[PDB]
Design a protein around this ligand. Sequence first.
Ligand code: ZN
Ligand code: ZN
Ligand code: ZN
Lengths: 645, 636, 96
Amino acid sequence: QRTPKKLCIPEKTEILAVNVDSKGVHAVLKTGNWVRYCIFDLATGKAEQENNFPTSSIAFLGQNERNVAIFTAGQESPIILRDGNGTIYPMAKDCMGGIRDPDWLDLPPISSLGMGVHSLINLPANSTIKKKAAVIIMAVEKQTLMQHILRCDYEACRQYLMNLEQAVVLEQNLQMLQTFISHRCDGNRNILHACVSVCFPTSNKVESKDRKANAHFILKLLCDSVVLQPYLRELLSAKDARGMTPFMSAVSGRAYPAAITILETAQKIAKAEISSSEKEEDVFMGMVCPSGTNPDDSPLYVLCCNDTCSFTWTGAEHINQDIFECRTCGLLESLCCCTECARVCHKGHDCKLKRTSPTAYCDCWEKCKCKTLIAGQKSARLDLLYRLLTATNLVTLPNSRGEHLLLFLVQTVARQTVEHCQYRPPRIREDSDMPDHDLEPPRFAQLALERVLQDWNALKSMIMFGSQENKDPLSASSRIGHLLPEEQVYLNQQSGTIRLDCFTHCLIVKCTADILLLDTLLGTLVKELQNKYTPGRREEAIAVTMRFLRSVARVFVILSVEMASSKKKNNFIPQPIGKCKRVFQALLPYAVEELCNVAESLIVPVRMGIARPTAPFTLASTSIDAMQGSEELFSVEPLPPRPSS
Amino acid sequence: NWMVSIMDSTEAQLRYGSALASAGDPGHPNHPLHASQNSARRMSARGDFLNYALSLMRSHNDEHSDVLPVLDVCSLKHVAYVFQALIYWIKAMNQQTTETGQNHPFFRRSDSMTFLGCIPPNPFEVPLAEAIPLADQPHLLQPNARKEDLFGRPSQGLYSSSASSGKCLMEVTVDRNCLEVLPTKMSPPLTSFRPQCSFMGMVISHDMLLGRWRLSLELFGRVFMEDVGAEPGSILTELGGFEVKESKFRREMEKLRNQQSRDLSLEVDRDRDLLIQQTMRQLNNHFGRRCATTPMAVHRVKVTFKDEPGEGSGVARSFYTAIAQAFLSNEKLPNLECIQNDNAPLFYQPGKRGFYTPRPGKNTEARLNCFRNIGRILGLCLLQNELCPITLNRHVIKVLLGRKVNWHDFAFFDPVMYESLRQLILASQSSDADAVFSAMDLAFAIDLCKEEGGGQVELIPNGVNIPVTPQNVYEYVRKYAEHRMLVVAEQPLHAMRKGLLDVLPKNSLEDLTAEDFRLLVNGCGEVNVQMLISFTSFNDESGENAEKLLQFKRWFWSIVEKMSMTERQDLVYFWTSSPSLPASEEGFQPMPSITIRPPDDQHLPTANTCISRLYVPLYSSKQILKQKLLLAIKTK
Amino acid sequence: DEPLERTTNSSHANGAAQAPRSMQWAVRNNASSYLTSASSLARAYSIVIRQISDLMGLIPKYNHLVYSQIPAAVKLTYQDAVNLQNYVEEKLIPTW
Ligand SMILES: [Zn+2]
Ligand SMILES: [Zn+2]
Ligand SMILES: [Zn+2]
């Protein structure tokens, strides 16, 4: 091809870095805020394979846009990619053919990356050893405090901070201080991110425990350092490659003491900050859960969904449990991951549920890196839950599936009661890489549900879910502003109770193991009904109680209709209808009124002659059959909105 | 009170479903517009009752968001009878009781497009893609097509705004007890009685009641029509859709076609020029006598060719297709100087392709007679219940029917000029109108194309010098529209009306609109696979294997469905000698059928249009079947 | 596994398939009888009325039965009880 020929690229797309290998020509392209990775074949002349980065585009672009680079020898060598901040972005291919969720190498930025193809010779008798190799030479920058943190040296960090404060007293180190604040590692991570990363647990209970203790000491030193007080506000508000502030990274990585330290430091900073058109909440939520984050990265939801892998108690023996298949990691055709692994390990992958689920066990360890094998500290987890409940308003926000935190917790408890009865305790009666599997099944869902039900704001948000104020993304009535006003009137007249009906059904008829959850909910409702000092609390409590009682009445009516009142054995009640009766008795003056309204609703068509014809049906003689039918009726999802427009 | 409660509740449920449909995901199983909701193609009885009970409990306290109400309107026939009786009473007593510029009759919607009891959308604010969807998508016209999606979604002047009564407030609420407490809570010579229809403490007009329960009335008319619609003074029949009107028209045509003594018995050939010449001569000869009486009718119309044996109705359908396609070709017409013993093509497309309006010429008596003859052949197609594909514009058929052309016909004439004039008047409402009008410098004279005659014509006398001003733009626009609706083509439209009325009485021609006339004359706009599925009977004369003939029809429908427009039209031509299917089953004098002959390797399928039947061999090979069918339908 | 129909003259009973595609959800057509639905709704109403009767029967001994035994109970006074009885009677007047 004596004449140069064009390579087709999309319009209005900037090229960041290009290099050429045997496979074709590799490039990184940016349009707007969308950074991709393309490989063109010369014969095709167009974009043969284009891939999207799993990490965020803003993090990849970094502070400087001209540091992006691609390195390849040219004939047979891998691609080394270098992002905007100057560090190295790992590349790998999943089973579908995209860029895997990178495992950060903690390498500091590389100033120069030499790479060469070198043919190995003098091989004895032409052995099986490969004849050629790539020699990679690297020039890595000398970031003092970043490496000090990553190496977990308390003394080094203390000395560096003392020298820094002495220089600040000398008032001659402003530029270097600003430069140090701008230091980064892989994943657009600042110093606090490094402290959090080294604070992560490694195994269940330089020594690893000593390393963790030094990491906690370093994090506390950074938090309480006098010099870095004006700079902690920006560091705690900085987002890494996954859009996580240091607190969010701490929660996700199960470094709960670190998360508590960061949260109290954030509250301290928010209290001591100027009010120049900035509120306390707007400056605290900016560093706890910044606006724009997806609901599945909310610290409270991540805290509740961290749990532990099902393999950690089931062992290698099959157990009847819900099974998820992931397309990206390759967990297909008898390779299955548990419901705990579908919420953390595969958060973002093309993971779905296997409807036809035989007895199975989780093998997430043999297909991908499992972050659910190690469980953190229970007391710190509960304390962080308490503080996030009493400090922010995160519990009001739902998650990506449109369900409130209370609904998610109740469903988790209902599923766990069924699954954990299969637990085989460690009876005293070749595989070395198999994960440790001698720990109890998680018991955090029950405690979390009990504590959240005690919260008035959380219960108010859950019971009033689907009302005029509270709305979930997965509802056709969420966005209706683009419709005709006549249709908007009809869509705004009605209120949402599908989520509340699911909540009540899973709390009364599915959470059969325990009764204290319903008692907790009733206690909170009663406390707020009888509250008088707080203005307007009684009326709000009355409204919440009426809505909850209507939901309970619906569940009770459906259950009673399904069942048949057999005189034999004089049972007189199933367990769920007993729970509904307990709710009615505890809130009698309002329960009777709501029952009157429900009865009128049921009887009006009969006495107006407009009943809709229905085929006869038999009545269940057992509660196990009555639970079904009601399960199909209540455990349903609202109608999703119309995609796009 | 009982009827008001039931009807308001059911209207609230249907309206909620429509709103949710418009706001939901069509792919979800719970969506109203999903296949699973067809109610004929495809849970447990316990599940059904539990859904009903849960819906009843939820709708009682406005908690029904994101789920369709569970109702069976087919079980409300007694409510329909009660509503019909009460509406009859209201209408009877109400009948016993009984300018220019912006508010001009030309800018107001007529009964063809308007809704009873609902304020029509303003002709200016809403664009064409939403005000009149039929103009933007002319293929939406089907035998079962809602008036809402054809001419926009109407609005009603209701709700609490300046209203403190039950009827003044719209339904909204979905239960049946709140909508029962609402009607309860609100509560001389003998020849001058003058009733008042007080009833609900206010003067009640059937128009606002019809608008209040529009969806319920539409569903009642669609479902309850064999029993409720047969009652005297029924309003479901009065507000009937296309089905009732087409059945009535076809039965009236059958009545008007079965009392004559002499048939038509034309004499035409397959060429281009001599076909037209013989057609005109025979039509003139048949309709000729001193002081002709009331419009004469033909019991039957038979077409005979020269050097081509053939008898039946297939030849008539082929003649209709050929004469229509010939008159719609853009080329110079052969001279018609032999009628008594200038040559621009008859029709052209002003707007969207497929729709035609008359092209004026020198107004010679030959051209006028030709237009009268085309009106006569349209009337013949109406009477003989045969599809004659000539798709005229909406205003042309509207003036043929004798109705008054409004400004919304300009949308069907040419959408681009409609949008331009709408934007012009919308800017004219603003203060900067004078500057724009002076900049473009309009005048009461239009630069008509050579199609319209060329040159330039003055709208009103001494109006060339007079410019168009924002204080007088409306008249201008009206004149503009008028000069492209009736002024240019007065003579051709009058000739077509005379020709059409020469064969059909005025009385039967009434109670018809533009869309129904288009569906009866031109058939369905495009040939649909499901339409063929609805009327096609398979018979087999081989009897070789059950599975073979069971799969042959599936393969035939699969290969037909994958075809495109032109080859589908060719297939329907080779089958029934008419490109367009009839709107309903009635219209096919024989039922279309397909006969599976014993399998053969090389025998192209045949068709007899006398009974409109295909004879296809049992083609084992699919590609050979496709090739044979394509080559068979290639010929015309 | 679920095929469509390609034939004619398939009209048994019927009278509901003529509904518009937009409203087919609001239309139907082992028994599917009105009286079964009426009986089932009356049964549900009876269940609710029995529950209301039991709750109203617990009022005179509310403190001994509900308040002490259940950890979370709503305080109830005499005027609240009489207003409750009046409310229930007023709601049950129409069906009565
Ligand atoms: Zn797992
Ligand atoms: Zn995965
Ligand atoms: Zn895992």
